[PDB]
């Protein structure tokens, strides 16, 4: 912890090449600084580091299921419907993105573009080239390689043999102006990594994990029909709530803009939302630490859909909590999570 980052503000890190080499050790280090308390962090990599030599050979890359984003609502409360469109290349996507109809409006400060977004998000539905299976990293890149991070999340594939797309495999996201990502935590309350490869920025909104229940209570009051049908209806990723609506109901939050060549980290039970400024490309996957195991055991999942991501927590409890295995199996494990506490791997930084 309550001493480090007591204001729960987003923190930016500038590691050296030596500090940047070990992924998990840096995640543990930034938690010893109190970064997890905001639910989101920014990491600027060393200037010498490059994951790919050039982005000039990706026009023939196929986006199998691009989505037209239809937004409905008023007074800072919205519902986003994602409509599947036919397959298109990155060349076909860039032409539409940069066309007069879908291009970024003229602006001075970010506050002006942010005002423009919340005023126009229901008009001219844009196309989002989201959830594309793939990587833009070169095979030889060993530092922060999204396709092979080497965290404890590797146990799900190593022992079960289970492959979950976007969770333990990389996803690419081709954006344009006004394309959004609704309010959500990660599947099973995992962490996530987001690298922006090139193009226009991506802006983010975050709610601290310790205040996450307050956002859930507010969303349930605004969409009571959605709450009755599904316990975790926010996992459907359809709800847009503006920063003015958050401020009105006393929900604490912070904002941040990610530029090309920067990393964003999301922490367990960290609610986040945002939008793209214009044409770009991002890479994303999920990861875990020893701190996540308790969040995964207590994650409230979607009940109405049968395709949803659910991980067997058994393998993590057997290896990391052998003393609690019988207690947890009998349902006698009644552990209360402390969101301010850092991962046990942060021991060497104290």
């Amino acid at each position: 912890s309550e001493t480090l980052n007591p204001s729960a503000r987003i923190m930016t890190f500038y590691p050296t090449m030596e500090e940047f080499r070990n992924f998990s050790r840096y995640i543990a280090y930034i938690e010893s600084q109190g970064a997890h308390r905001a639910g989101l962090a920014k990491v600027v990599p060393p200037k010498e580091w490059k994951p790919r030599a050039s982005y000039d050979d990706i026009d023939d890359l196929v986006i199998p299921a691009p989505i037209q984003q239809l937004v409905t609502g008023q007074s800072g409360l919205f519902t986003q419907y994602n409509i599947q469109k036919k397959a298109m290349t990155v060349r076909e996507f860039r032409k539409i993105a940069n066309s007069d109809k879908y291009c970024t409006p003229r602006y001075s400060e970010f506050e002006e573009l942010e005002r423009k977004y919340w005023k126009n998000l229901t008009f001219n539905p844009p196309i989002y080239g989201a959830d594309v299976n793939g990587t833009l990293y070169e095979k030889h890149v060993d530092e922060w390689n999204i396709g092979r991070l080497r965290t404890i999340l590797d146990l799900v594939e190593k022992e079960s043999g289970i492959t979950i797309e976007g969770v333990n495999t990389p996803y690419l996201y081709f954006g344009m102006w006004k394309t959004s990502f609704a309010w959500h935590t990660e599947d099973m309350d995992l962490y996530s990594i987001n690298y922006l490869h090139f193009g226009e920025p991506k802006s983010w909104y975050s709610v601290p994990p310790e205040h996450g229940k307050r956002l859930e209570r507010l969303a349930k009051g605004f969409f009571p029909g959605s709450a009755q049908s599904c316990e975790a209806f926010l996992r459907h990723k359809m709800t847009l709530i503006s920063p003015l609506m958050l401020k009105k109901y006393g929900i604490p939050f912070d904002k941040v803009t990610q530029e090309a060549g920067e990393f964003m980290i999301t922490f367990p039970y960290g609610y986040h939302a945002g939008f793209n400024h214009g044409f770009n490309c991002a890479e994303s996957t999920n990861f875990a630490t020893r701190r996540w195991i308790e969040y995964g055991k207590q994650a409230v999942l979607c009940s109405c859909r049968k395709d949803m991501v659910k991980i067997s927590m058994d393998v993590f409890v057997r290896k990391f909590q052998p003393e609690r295995y019988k207690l947890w199996k009998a349902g006698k494990d009644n552990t209360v999570i402390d969101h301010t506490l850092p991962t046990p791997e942060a021991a060497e930084f104290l």
């Binding site: 797309e165 996803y171 990502f181 359809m238």
Partner: peptide, 7 residues
């Protein structure tokens, strides 16, 4: 299973 953007 599969990670999604919803809608």
């Amino acid at each position: 299973a599969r990670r999604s953007t919803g809608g």
